[PDB]
C-alpha cells in the first residue's frame, strides 16, 4: 500500500551543480514502454 510525503518546492536554483553530457542516440520504444538502443 503506497503513500506520499512532501519533499520540497519545484523551483529552478541559480548556481546548482552543473554535470552530465548530451549524447545523441537512436532509440526504439516498444509496446511495454521500454526504450532500447538501435545500431
Q: Are 28 and 36 in contact (CB under 8 A)?
A: yes
> In angstroms, what is the minimal distance from the CB of 28 to other proteins?
7
The verdict on 31 binding other proteins (CB under 8 A) reads: yes
> In angstroms, what is the minimal distance from the CB of 14 to other proteins?
10
Q: How many angstroms separate the CA atoms of 33 and 11, rounded?
A: 29
Q: How many angstroms separate the CA atoms of 27 and 36, rounded?
A: 6
The verdict on 27 binding other proteins (CB under 8 A) reads: yes
Binding stretches for other proteins (CB under 8 A): 1-13, 16-29, 31-33, 35-37
Amino acid at each position: 500500500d503506497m503513500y506520499i510525503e512532501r519533499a520540497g518546492d519545484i523551483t529552478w536554483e541559480k548556481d546548482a551543480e552543473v554535470t552530465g553530457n548530451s549524447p545523441r542516440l537512436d532509440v526504439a520504444l516498444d509496446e511495454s514502454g521500454d526504450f532500447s538502443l538501435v545500431e
